[PDB]
């Protein structure tokens, strides 16, 4: 009842080159990794590695909704912009291979009211 991703434990995923890991992800993630990371993602990754090393005792806030979750990011809490505020996300092992934006909804759930004037033919 441990975690496995394609028959690998978490540690085996930790000690992998970015290329070796890219062969396990779905096609969209593989193409995104092969084409390189954008500069903003580079800065975010630098901050993440610093925080893991034992420095940067501050919360991580980022505008990068298109960043792919990587195994070395597991255990940290990231604040992802949803359009008007930063929401906390706690990265769990079963999130590997997803974009960050999937965990920060940008619209509010709809609870309908009573239909107003002009909602039907007879109300006009």
């Amino acid at each position: 009842k441990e975690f496995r991703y394609r028959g690998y434990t978490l540690e085996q995923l930790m000690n992998m080159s970015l290329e070796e890991l890219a062969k396990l992800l779905p096609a969209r993630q593989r193409r995104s990794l092969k084409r390189g990371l954008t500069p903003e993602q580079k800065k975010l990754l630098r901050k993440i590695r610093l925080a893991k090393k034992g420095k940067y005792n501050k919360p991580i806030r980022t505008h990068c909704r298109d960043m792919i979750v990587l195994p070395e990011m597991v255990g940290l809490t990231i604040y992802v912009h949803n359009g008007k505020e930063f929401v906390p996300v706690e990265i769990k092992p079963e999130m590997i291979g997803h974009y960050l934006g999937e965990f920060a909804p940008t619209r509010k759930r709809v609870q309908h009211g009573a239909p107003g004037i002009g909602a039907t033919r007879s109300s006009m």
């Binding site: 496995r4 079963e94 997803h98 999937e102």
Partner: protein, 141 residues
Amino acid sequence: DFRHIVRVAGVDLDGNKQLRWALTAIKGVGINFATMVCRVAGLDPFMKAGYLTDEQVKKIEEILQDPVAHGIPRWAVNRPKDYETGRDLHLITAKLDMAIREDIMRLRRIRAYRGIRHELGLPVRGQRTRSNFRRGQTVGV
């Protein structure tokens, strides 16, 4: 000789149909995959299902257990590259149902967008919802 009901892999099969179409009653087997397994087993896909003998049924079930090891291509199975083991699997009946349920449950545990959409019973693959997808009752003004 002729049997009007033949039991294969826990599903009764109509004995009057051609074997390729009789096989589709199994959940997880469509018309294309059925023809593939008929060809691999070396049986005429146009024969009546009622003329199957016991050894032939045993062989068909053996093939359905692990198609890849019997020569069926990896790009033909309904769950390639399994999320847990990493292998190429083909699931039928209950196993298929519980695998799909587990996939949706995993999506729901991490509070992903698609998991929320599954919970609320709303379209998941990006459809517009202002006009179509209406299932309910007209409200009064």
